[PDB]
Write a protein that binds this ligand. Sequence first.
Ligand SMILES: Nc1nc2c(ncn2[C@@H]2O[C@H](COP(=O)(O)OP(=O)(O)OP(=O)(O)O)[C@@H](O)[C@H]2O)c(=O)[nH]1
Ligand SMILES: Nc1nc2c(ncn2[C@@H]2O[C@H](COP(=O)(O)OP(=O)(O)OP(=O)(O)O)[C@@H](O)[C@H]2O)c(=O)[nH]1
Ligand SMILES: Nc1nc2c(ncn2[C@@H]2O[C@H](COP(=O)(O)OP(=O)(O)O)[C@@H](O)[C@H]2O)c(=O)[nH]1
Ligand SMILES: Nc1nc2c(ncn2[C@@H]2O[C@H](COP(=O)(O)OP(=O)(O)O)[C@@H](O)[C@H]2O)c(=O)[nH]1
Ligand SMILES: [Mg+2]
Ligand SMILES: [Mg+2]
Lengths: 432, 432, 430, 430
Amino acid sequence: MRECISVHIGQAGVQMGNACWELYCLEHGIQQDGIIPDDSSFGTFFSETGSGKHVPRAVFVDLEQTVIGEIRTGHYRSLFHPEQLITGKEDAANNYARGHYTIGKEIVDSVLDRVRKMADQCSGLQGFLIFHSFGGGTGSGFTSLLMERLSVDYGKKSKLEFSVYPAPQISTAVVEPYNSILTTHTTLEHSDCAFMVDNEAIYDICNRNLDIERPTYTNLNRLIGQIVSSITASLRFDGALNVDLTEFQTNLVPYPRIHFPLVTYSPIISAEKAYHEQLSVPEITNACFEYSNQMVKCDPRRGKYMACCLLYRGDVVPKDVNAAIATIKTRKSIQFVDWCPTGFKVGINYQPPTAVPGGDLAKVQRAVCMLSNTTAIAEAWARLDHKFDLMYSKRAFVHWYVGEGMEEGEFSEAREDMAALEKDYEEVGTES
Amino acid sequence: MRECISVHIGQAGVQMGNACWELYCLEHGIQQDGIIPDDSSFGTFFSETGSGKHVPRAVFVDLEQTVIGEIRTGHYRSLFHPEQLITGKEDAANNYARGHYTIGKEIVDSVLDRVRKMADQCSGLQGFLIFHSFGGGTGSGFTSLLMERLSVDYGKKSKLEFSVYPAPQISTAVVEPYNSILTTHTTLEHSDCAFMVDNEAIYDICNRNLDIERPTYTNLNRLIGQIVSSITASLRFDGALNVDLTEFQTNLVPYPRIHFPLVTYSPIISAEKAYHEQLSVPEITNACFEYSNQMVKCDPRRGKYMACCLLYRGDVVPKDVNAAIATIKTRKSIQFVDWCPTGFKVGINYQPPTAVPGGDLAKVQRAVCMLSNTTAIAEAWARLDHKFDLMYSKRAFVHWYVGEGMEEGEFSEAREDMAALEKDYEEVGTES
Amino acid sequence: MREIVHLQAGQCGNQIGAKFWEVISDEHGIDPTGAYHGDSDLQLERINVYYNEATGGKYVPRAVLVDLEPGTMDSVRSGPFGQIFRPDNFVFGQSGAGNNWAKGHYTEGAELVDSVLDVVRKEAESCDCLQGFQLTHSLGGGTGSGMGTLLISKIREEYPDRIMNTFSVVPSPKVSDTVVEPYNATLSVHQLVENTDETYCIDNEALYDICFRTLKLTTPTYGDLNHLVSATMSGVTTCLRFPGQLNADLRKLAVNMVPFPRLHFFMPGFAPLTSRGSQQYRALTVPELTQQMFDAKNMMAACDPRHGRYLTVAAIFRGRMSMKEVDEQMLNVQNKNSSYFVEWIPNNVKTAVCDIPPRGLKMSATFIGNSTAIQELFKRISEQFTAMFRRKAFLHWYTGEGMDEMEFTEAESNMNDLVSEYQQYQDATA
Amino acid sequence: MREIVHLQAGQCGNQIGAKFWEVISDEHGIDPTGAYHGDSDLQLERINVYYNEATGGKYVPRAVLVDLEPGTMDSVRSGPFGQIFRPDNFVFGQSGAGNNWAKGHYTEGAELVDSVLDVVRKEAESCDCLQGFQLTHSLGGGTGSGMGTLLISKIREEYPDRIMNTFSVVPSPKVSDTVVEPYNATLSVHQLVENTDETYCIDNEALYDICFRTLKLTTPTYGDLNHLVSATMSGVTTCLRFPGQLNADLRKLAVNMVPFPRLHFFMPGFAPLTSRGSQQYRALTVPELTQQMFDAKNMMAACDPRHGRYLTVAAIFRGRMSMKEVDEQMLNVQNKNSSYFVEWIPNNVKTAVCDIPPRGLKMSATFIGNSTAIQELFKRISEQFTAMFRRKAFLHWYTGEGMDEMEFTEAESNMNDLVSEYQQYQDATA
Ligand SMILES: Nc1nc2c(ncn2[C@@H]2O[C@H](COP(=O)(O)OP(=O)(O)OP(=O)(O)O)[C@@H](O)[C@H]2O)c(=O)[nH]1
Ligand SMILES: Nc1nc2c(ncn2[C@@H]2O[C@H](COP(=O)(O)OP(=O)(O)OP(=O)(O)O)[C@@H](O)[C@H]2O)c(=O)[nH]1
Ligand SMILES: Nc1nc2c(ncn2[C@@H]2O[C@H](COP(=O)(O)OP(=O)(O)O)[C@@H](O)[C@H]2O)c(=O)[nH]1
Ligand SMILES: Nc1nc2c(ncn2[C@@H]2O[C@H](COP(=O)(O)OP(=O)(O)O)[C@@H](O)[C@H]2O)c(=O)[nH]1
Ligand SMILES: [Mg+2]
Ligand SMILES: [Mg+2]
């Protein structure tokens, strides 16, 4: 009855999506194909066919064809419908203009068509899930290009996105400030809620809590996959207090231009060290608010919370949740904004998280995923804006963007728009 | 009780006819001869003899003898009555005059005689099916010559024709504009409904939907054969809502001079990618109105629909057809003309399409063939007329036609007649 | 006595009629071969209404199946209960009508209408007391609209006093299945309004909803709809065939349902209609059966009665019932929905109770309603007719068969007057 | 007679209502399939209050389950006692409310409210003597606060004289489970104060304490709390269904519990409530049952009555009891806690005694209290509402759905007046 269209753009989205659908397939008994062995709630994500084949309700799109080609040759080769996997000719070369103006103009129409065919095949449309990188290229131009198209064709339907926000120190591309800011300018008015994750933060978690000194991108993707499974768990499985994807919007977004919650997943514990932990509800709940466990390298205590959503899974007693949250409300270090007396949105589900074979996480009994909106993230934009200003003053790489369909004016507009957003956070963070 | 006389003229008709009668033979259990192994509705197309031999009710005619000779030596050598396969001495050499005036004058009488013998052997005459190329030669002169003879000897009997309309860009003959326009001038007043197909369009379908990079004319013919099987399915097989060949005339022809519907066949899907498609009634119905699936390379949305016929086959529930059409009526992009509130003619049959062994199409459960009359085809005539005007201004190839029985006046008359037809579409396409 | 002679037409008539005779035979205990194996003796007492007798107990339906193509009839005889009919009654042509009223009325059906009468008169002459003719067809087709109206005119000129009741499938508003429906429908109504005593308008869109909403059926074939149409056809002719507390002859309904000569178009309904899973959540008593009959969603016509007023209403009950409840419930409806009933008719409800219910049912009730809301149907057809006719949409297929443009104008004007007449009587006294 | 029609809303309503019907069926001897297998005959005499009858003894609850998402209802039917309901009563949408009152009241629930009434009116019309409507929902959600108040307004405009009693789950003060509770609660109360005759305020924090302190339960599921809410709902409607020495109809409580029209908010309580291990350390007699009913720790609302005064009180006893003890104990409370009862009401206690106790219990008693202390709840909501609304915390989710900022001001002002009215009557005469 419910549905979600997963759109994965760029290398980050495709690789993250692979972890997601590997986890979804496990959670429903699917067999790496559309087949189910000789399991009833898959309707939200997986379509059905008379042959017994389940077709994922996802679209894998990339202007580069290397990563998507690996899927077509991987173990999930027979899972996706071939027309869903859309591949362009040449990549955007880490250039926002190429993804948005020149290359994206030749592929945006094709992906939109497949979405349209999926959209009218749903009993009722609930929203979208967008996975993309913030670094740049397809993840910035194409995603911004695709998001604006959706805002018109589907209007008021929900559009959730998970983004690989740039890390403070670690960086992989030299022109991230240009692409990261440009996508933000063109996506603020077209996105409902954006969930942020940084590789450095998950690297810290993977080595600080999981006893692994060699994190690969596969490790991070599986950690991100668990977060998405919890967010969409309410639709997929039964529970005591369900939460829907349309609720996150009003629960975490107090103002239209401030919709960037952080992400957290508490029971990130190694198998060996799980034997020495009780893993009760109160302790995992308190773990969420520690700086050491945020999936975005931004310390919450530098600012004020303004909205939090707690999504519990497994054998969870609601009474403990009531007690656990109240004590957190008592702590003077965990500061909530003045104008939000009601801070927490609580959802409880009976399905414990499933551990992927070969994974690093332990066989946990109960888990919690926290989606917290905080003014602390304003610092991250300030750092990103500071980097952007340095390069633009010298016109460090402008000629690449100007010569591929963009204009010098857009750089100024994007930075000025970000400046207002940084100012907007300050107004929200001050009372009287 | 019902009947149809299939007349195949020129190389296109003969090769297309071979695909048709290969498919008809399969659909009735015939064994590549007139024999049936140790199956009751064949009377419409196949005559019967006491020996158990079924004689096709078709006439293969060509001024060239190469293609017909291949049939006499092919696997269907023993199927046709020898006098049906009529062969001239020399081809028309892609000249309309030779087919119409000089060569055709020595063979038209012979083919008409065999039609006469078939006509009076029918319990009741229902109409004709004419297969011919629009490029020129026998398909333009002989067909126009034959059609006018039929209009007198048989008068008000239905005369349906399937034509290989010239493609916009792809072309195989240098003088198509002369022959294509000339046949149209002499066939407007003698034809009831003309179904158009372009090789480029079917090439696009064959590579865009069927995953084949090497389409041969055999591939296109089989695709065309399926269309004809659906059109004549109502006569051949039982169904819930049958449609007869005399109905297409009043359902698709609003005016005597505008009888050129397009063609579409929705479930054109590869065997491998059929496993990932539900292939329900609503989706295949919506596929018909997409530009990407028209069998004629003319975009419908450039103009307005004025009449549509839907012919469903297989396991089809009429309720879904009612629902599926109504939503299409709702879309504002699918624009119907003002003066046709009643747009759709619906026919349902219980016989699913049969897949020829060695074919490319999948083993579909249900299929739909759409016959849509649209003002968009007026653009195709305009493009064809534009090409004709360029050549005629220079008298590019006139001497060939003038010296073989034709006159300079006919070129002017034919073009002027086409100009009125193009103007006629404009009047129909404007309301108040 | 009071024999009814059944007449078919077009593909729609034969399909509906075929299911009509399957049901009628079932409730009379007639085998598909024609033999009688019923349990009760009452079902055999009045079997002469629909069946003729022969040696060995074979019972021959008094039906005439006709169409301009042999295909549909060949299906009828081949299918179940197809051998029951007498072969001589299949009057068929070779060249079918192309869904154009002109061909089936003036040119093609003209040369076949004479043969049909030769069978009707032989059938009609064999009745001890002829009550009337029952016809099933579709107004949107060629054979039905053209030949059906041609047959009606001939019979009404040959049996003026007998009652001609027609069950006509009317084009639906949502989606069509024939491009030239407005021409065929308008021309047919121009004939029916003068030569039939009562017409029962049904549209496939309405019957799809009844199955989707009420019966909760996911694969509704045309056979499913025909069963509903058969049930209403069976219900209206139960008094002639079974005993009851209060009987209602076919002519009895027309007097109570037709105030003025031209307003003889009804929209029927049937009850109860429950899904296989919802059968255990109903009391199945008189109060609830009457409740859904007047519900707008349980009517076999697109028009919603809430948009107009009921000139008259008929409720033919079946099965052993408390006559008090029937009178009380019917009065209750008259009270609550007093705004839905015309005010110059003091009583709008006609009640009839047949003693024997349909097979497998304890109770049943057939609704018949003459409402001014039916003007909505005709105005919609008039709107579509004038849009096409304003610029000669498809006339040459009709004018070429023998018609003239003046006939179209007369049909439209006559159609417009009927809509006006319905509207005039929807205004209260003075 | 005196039939009650049950209406659900939101996730909370369906969960509580589902447990409500499990208990009601248990005390009436109704199997989950719908059959009757009870021992006593009294439980079958008045079964028409909540159940409708069908063939074969199946009893169909007169319940309407509705929500803007199918997930919760799908759980209800799949779970135990889920097949009992009639399928037609499940009126559900596809796109759920995002916990915003505007969506469920103006935009999303607006297009679904009409269907719900079509089921309510059919249910209501089938009652010999309609007593009123019973509604269960939550004020902190979207479907409950928005659609529930929408349903209340429609019914109160269509059945003005019938009694509308609502069991509403009120947001707790300690911790919330929805960020926008103040907006939803304030908007809902702006509607209830005008269109319901009695509302029973319950908060999950209070019911957690009852289980933690009294029942000594260590793993309290939401099912456990729903059972307590079911018991109080069952108790208040025992007079209608069983005999007793002194009966108290639903309208009887409202007159004795509602002095002024706007002060119709009560905080219920139940007794006895003992842990499995503490059952053997109680006499289980009338004096002690009354003792804990007025105890602040045995009430299902956060507000403590010690902070205010009781305008009125109702005690509905079950089981065979000495009427003298009931009168004596109730008088004793009136004497000791004379400071806790308002002084312009000479008598504040209404006593009712049903003869038959709940299954497995010899005695029971349900407390209902109208206290000025409930102003504490509304003032807390008002404080949170104004804090958020002072700087447009989440309005754009509400104004974008069709609401206007003026409506929020009206709701806050109306909420403030109710708090003032409660405070005015907490001052003694003159
Ligand atoms: N979590 C996670 N992040 C990734 C992954 N792959 C790439 N990234 C992030 O993406 C950024 C690099 O840009 P890409 O995502 O490769 O850009 P793209 O999608 O290839 O688009 P083009 O540059 O046009 O090819 C880095 O900062 C990474 O943080 C992945 O598998 N998992
Ligand atoms: N679909 C289809 N089209 C064909 C086929 N063979 C030829 N054509 C079309 O016919 C055109 C060429 O003219 P022909 O059909 O060969 O002319 P002809 O019938 O040989 O007549 P002459 O020129 O006098 O020999 C091309 O534009 C093709 O599109 C065929 O097998 N299938
Ligand atoms: N109930 C029912 N309606 C039918 C059936 N077949 C056709 N119809 C209706 O009849 C109309 C078609 O007219 P038709 O009778 O086939 O034209 P004709 O037979 O050539 O005069 C369509 O609009 C259908 O709604 C059937 O089997 N059952
Ligand atoms: N007693 C009880 N309360 C519930 C249950 N589910 C939700 N609630 C309460 O209902 C509130 C949530 O509102 P909800 O009904 O889910 O919003 P809506 O359904 O979208 O209108 C929470 O504050 C819970 O305290 C339940 O199963 N039992
Ligand atoms: Mg790349
Ligand atoms: Mg040739």
